[PDB]
Structure 1
Amino acid sequence: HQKRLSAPSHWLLDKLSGAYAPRPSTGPHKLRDCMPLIVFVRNRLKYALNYRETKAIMMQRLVKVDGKVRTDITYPAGFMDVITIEKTGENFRLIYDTKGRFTVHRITDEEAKYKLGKVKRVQLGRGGVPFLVTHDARTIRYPDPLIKVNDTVKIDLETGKITDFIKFDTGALAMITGGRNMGRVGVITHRERHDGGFGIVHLKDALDNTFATRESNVFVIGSEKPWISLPK
């Protein structure tokens, strides 16, 4: 029941969708780190028109988010989730622009089959078992032992297994997913530890603009290796 004006600005909405905006259901992604599926399909991608329209389309099993059908209308689709629609036969990834607003990449199954998920935390579970928690809140039993925090992992999304990983590297191109300079594509060139809390990295763009960003909100994409096709 929140207002369209209280709706965050990185998911876009015009002046004519009524005063209210729907609140996202709880899930893997965070509240303000979400674009709801209805906002995707009918408010950003305009494939349906009405609430009940979107509702009916999701009641029938036509869309699968990250390889799995999703039926709840306000499911959290936060960042680089792949969305297949088999009727048009088109898949979509959710990234930012340089302006820090949501952007959608049309894509086929060839690049759509995997996900570059950012590691949150590795642990030793019950039975002493090593498991992995990524940014998508997905856990992986028995990962490869080298992948610690601040690494990303190419994930199979059909078996969901590890397919690759990129190490946290001052020298790797990264992406900004938070803060005042949110959504700036550039290379990590330095990192300052700040032991005692809230350490940062120094990251310049491709066109000589260096800025200090927190290792919390950083997100690596590849050293060069554009493993997800950014739109030109």
Structure 2
Amino acid sequence: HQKRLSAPSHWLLDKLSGAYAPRPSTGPHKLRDCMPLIVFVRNRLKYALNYRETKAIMMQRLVKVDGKVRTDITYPAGFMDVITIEKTGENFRLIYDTKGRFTVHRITDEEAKYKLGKVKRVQLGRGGVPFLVTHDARTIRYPDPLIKVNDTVKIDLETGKITDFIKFDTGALAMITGGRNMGRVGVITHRERHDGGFGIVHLKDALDNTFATRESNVFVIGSEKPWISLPK
């Protein structure tokens, strides 16, 4: 039940939606790194007008998020969730811009079929099996045995299996998803360890601005290989 100004500055609200703002329900993505489905439908896309209209869209099986039907209105969809609407025949993708806000991208089924997800941790689960945890809280059982931490994975999204992976690399272009230099698509050119907590990388854009961002806030997107269509 937070106010419209206490809502974060990256899912935008104008002077229109009242003094209050919806809170995202608990789910895969975080609270402050989130776009709820009602803000995506009626405050960003404007396929709806009111809360009851958004409910009348959501309750019938017309909005699918990451390939599954998401019914509740304030479902969290933070980063790179393909959002398939079949009556309009569109699939939107959530990326950022250079200023630090949410951006929507229209696309069809060929790029809508896969999800590029960053690995959070690799472990040995119960049954003596290695399993893999992404930032979408997707756990994949029996992964490829080189996919370590901070590697990204092309998730199939019709079975959910691994298809390809991109390694953490000095020389692979990356996207920033946090910090004071948030949302700046550039190339990882250096990486400093700082063992004892909070190591960094040094990263430059396409046009020569060096800056240091933390290896938590980084997010690998591809060496050149823009596997998701960043908007031209």
TM-score by length of 2: 0.99
Q: Deviations over 1:69-92 (max 9, x none)?
A: 000100000001000000110001
| Structure 1 residue 195 displacement after superposition | 0.2
Please state whether the residue corresponding to 2:43 is helix, strand or coil.
helix
Supply the distance in 1 between the matched residues of 2:42 and 2:32 (Cα, whole angstroms): 19
CA RMSD of aligned residues (A): 0.4
Supply the distance in 2 between the matched residues of 1:223 and 1:16 (Cα, whole angstroms): 41
The corresponding residue for 2:155 is 155
Q: Deviations over 1:128-171 (max 9, x none)?
A: 11000001000000000000001000010000000100000010
Please state whether the residue corresponding to 1:207 is helix, strand or coil.
coil
| Structure 1 residue 224 displacement after superposition | 0.4
Q: Deviations over 1:14-72 (max 9, x none)?
A: 01110000111000000011110000000000001000000011000001000000001
Supply the distance in 2 between the matched residues of 1:137 and 1:127 (Cα, whole angstroms): 20
The corresponding residue for 2:227 is 227
Q: Deviations over 1:177-222 (max 9, x none)?
A: 0000000000000000000000000000000001000000000100
Supply the distance in 2 between the matched residues of 1:109 and 1:16 (Cα, whole angstroms): 34
Supply the distance in 1 between the matched residues of 2:125 and 2:58 (Cα, whole angstroms): 36
Supply the distance in 1 between the matched residues of 2:202 and 2:176 (Cα, whole angstroms): 12
Q: Deviations over 1:70-124 (max 9, x none)?
A: 0010000000100000011000100100001000000000001000000000000
The corresponding residue for 2:54 is 54
Supply the distance in 2 between the matched residues of 1:16 and 1:102 (Cα, whole angstroms): 19
Unaligned runs of 5+ in 1: none
Supply the distance in 1 between the matched residues of 2:69 and 2:28 (Cα, whole angstroms): 15
The corresponding residue for 2:108 is 108
The corresponding residue for 1:144 is 144
Please state whether the residue corresponding to 1:174 is helix, strand or coil.
strand
The corresponding residue for 2:134 is 134
Supply the distance in 2 between the matched residues of 1:109 and 1:27 (Cα, whole angstroms): 25
Supply the distance in 1 between the matched residues of 2:115 and 2:67 (Cα, whole angstroms): 11
The corresponding residue for 2:93 is 93
Supply the distance in 2 between the matched residues of 1:17 and 1:136 (Cα, whole angstroms): 29
What is the percent sequence identity of the aligned residues? 100
Unaligned runs of 5+ in 2: none
4+ residue runs of structure 1 moved beyond 4 angstroms?
Answer: none
Supply the distance in 2 between the matched residues of 1:196 and 1:55 (Cα, whole angstroms): 48
The corresponding residue for 2:176 is 176
Matched, 1:69 2:69: yes
TM-score by length of 1: 0.99
| Structure 1 residue 127 displacement after superposition | 1.1
Supply the distance in 2 between the matched residues of 1:105 and 1:40 (Cα, whole angstroms): 12
